[PDB]
Assembly symmetry: D2
Homo-oligomer: 242 residues x 4
Amino acid sequence: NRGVIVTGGGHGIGKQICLDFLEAGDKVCFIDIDEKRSADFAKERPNLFYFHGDVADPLTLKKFVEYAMEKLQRIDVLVNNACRGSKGILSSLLYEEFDYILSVGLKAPYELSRLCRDELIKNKGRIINIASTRAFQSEPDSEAYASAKGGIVALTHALAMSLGPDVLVNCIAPGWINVTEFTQEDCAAIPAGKVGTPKDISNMVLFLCQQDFITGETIIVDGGMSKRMIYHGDWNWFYKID
Amino acid sequence: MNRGVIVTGGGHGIGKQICLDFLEAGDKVCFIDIDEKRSADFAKERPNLFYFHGDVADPLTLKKFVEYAMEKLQRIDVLVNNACRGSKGILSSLLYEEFDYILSVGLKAPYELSRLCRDELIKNKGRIINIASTRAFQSEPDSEAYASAKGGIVALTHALAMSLGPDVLVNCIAPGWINVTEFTQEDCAAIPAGKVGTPKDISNMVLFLCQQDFITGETIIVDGGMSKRMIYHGDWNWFYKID
Amino acid sequence: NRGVIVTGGGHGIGKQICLDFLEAGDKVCFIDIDEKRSADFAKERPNLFYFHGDVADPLTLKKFVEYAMEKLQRIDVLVNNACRGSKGILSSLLYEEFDYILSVGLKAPYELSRLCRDELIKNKGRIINIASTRAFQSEPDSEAYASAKGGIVALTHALAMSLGPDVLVNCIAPGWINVTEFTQEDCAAIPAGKVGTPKDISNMVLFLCQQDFITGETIIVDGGMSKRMIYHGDWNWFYKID
Amino acid sequence: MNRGVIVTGGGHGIGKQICLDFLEAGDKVCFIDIDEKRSADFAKERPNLFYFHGDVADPLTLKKFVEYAMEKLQRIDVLVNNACRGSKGILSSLLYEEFDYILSVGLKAPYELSRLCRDELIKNKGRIINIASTRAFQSEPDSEAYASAKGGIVALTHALAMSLGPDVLVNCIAPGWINVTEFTQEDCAAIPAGKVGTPKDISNMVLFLCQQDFITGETIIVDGGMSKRMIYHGDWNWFYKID
Ligand code: NA
Ligand code: NA
Ligand code: NA
Ligand code: NA
């Protein structure tokens, strides 16, 4: 019986989150940059509404929220999900492209939260932000993605402290989620022994929305990878110089 | 049967609710607890709930408990390490032996029960859930013993996860203020979520984690947002008073 | 003997960092938005050069780096410091103003690092980012500041992983630093029993620049405040409903 | 005299270098260490350096050590808790008593020495520095005992800081790979900072922290960036090999 808005809803983790809310009995409105896949996803699913647009554009965010209000009539849950990867300093990623990554991954979650503020407060709703374990550890050439994801982890506790007790706000930080065959080493290198699936994330989204004593938190869902201490030559790991 | 579940501190509070939740889920549960009367009462006329009276501080008792559990459950799928005992610390000049006792119940017992159950949990592709506290990460004065045990169990969690993966997944929940026994308007309002926690908040998370297969090594804070609230005297409704 | 560039150098923490590097024997070029105070700071200090401009503007960042290269002839250390506070969601801080806070506090550190990349690599230099304990805990209405500071903490490890081993990159997260009389309660509430000073931060900046086995790290310098567990009615703390 | 400094594990490695650094700073240093020969040699013909032979695992020994230190130093200004002993864990089925012994040296000793020195440190407005490990925060397999002790000492750090502030400030350093005894090209390149750590990297941080007055309760990672490197098999030069 909830109205749920989801960003990045036409594929991967976002798609599975939309499906899981539909299955829970909710109505879902999602925004996504790819019209074809998104229209198809929504087709012949009467409680699933698609809005085509780029979350990088603030005016689009306002029109998206207006559209969702027209279709859902109420907003109980906002899920901020933005998958776009990027390069960084080793690629000399230009200022404008770094900024764009921030627009999609950090400005949009703020602005959608701001647009939906009163409605979520009134409905005693929930905000769920999807980050990444890249907020906390880095591979080389990841500056833009790292910056957006670190920012959304902090934004999560900021929003939680602003909007509590009426709105609870939490973050999930996925590791490697298959959104598209893997080698034996690919799977065995992860402590949990498998690659993640969008359902591992969506199960956590739905669970967190039903809790009432968790707010401000970021939960890591990465099969234990970030907790594995790795030194060259020890416990099956090796570094190669090119 | 479904799962065989062992729980420490099962006769009261959080441990009691975790036991009940696993029973409702269809499992068989064996718990250890230091208080015979309350625990025997809890298990009475509940055929899938078995009580073992003992102190987890004693390693011989831990071995006897696991043996008892295997007799009653015939399999062990989930181990829940829960130890509530609070203590004092350096301002109270808490003695060495008393500090050690808190470590025995809060840190040694979870390790030893994991070790005793190792092969069984691996065989059954089971789960270990450790209950810590937000006191692992921030402190009030005179909390050294509790802090040390809880910080230890948070680290033990990722150690066990790295040792026992992929067959056993191991995670930790760090509760804040959970009501285990009337609160003022300020009591509830001071917590960002605006309520005091309940044992169901924790047990719900235990049962959920046991069903996940891509979370291991993690500690999840369940404290109504309290640890995330920045607090400075005189700002945003908080004030410090000098005695 | 180092060339050091510092942002926000005309006041507060930035000012003290500039002074400490001058005292260490270095040449320092700083950017700052307030011409009068900054020109005065640089006056009759021949190894201290001031560049007036807004770090929010990428073209200004390029001209600043060009100016510093002309005056210093080499860049060994980059210190990213941006003090500007802001409101947040409870004030309904507009998208553009949230973005501006990100420009100064997150885009600028990236872009200056990018502009200085080759020079810092060549000189085996150091980047020091100044964040805040607000990256990790929040008061209400802090979304913009939280987002920028969380982003810079993550940017720190991203840059460290990209630029190691040649450039080491670390972050300091100050708590309450006096940059402008306090009550007995003000001071006693902080576990260390005092309010911080810009020298507490600058001492850490200079120390970190001399280390060679610390990279990617954020060090909290807040007198222990973030580590104090606080519940209403316990250990001398009290919450008041208005 | 200047400061009176007590250091555990002072006869070798990191502890040895910390002792030397305090001596060079003009202080008097008393250390305890389990190896009599190497420690007596270290103290020989260094009048401001005093050695006490003993096992920090023994609480009676800890009390005797502090008494000895007060006799030789006449004041205690700085306590440095350092304990290097590695151990095995659950995959080795490390027994209860051996797990406990690691806790005794790594977690109980720092608490008890802080307690024994409490009034003296408060009077002198002193410092406690705890040496942990990045193994408090991430794990390799079979590390349960070391992880538990190091996680415990990181939490103990903020507990002591909250108890003893504002008079005593208390901080922790978490070293990564420190050479305490020839490395391959891959050994050094795998670390983001491109070198193996040295005991001076740690001692420099100890002496620096003792001089700060607005840092307390904190753990600083000194590991060349290793814990911050995200590593996935097959990407960015790292590979996992199945036995
Ligand atoms: Na539809
Ligand atoms: Na029964
Ligand atoms: Na000048
Ligand atoms: Na001597």
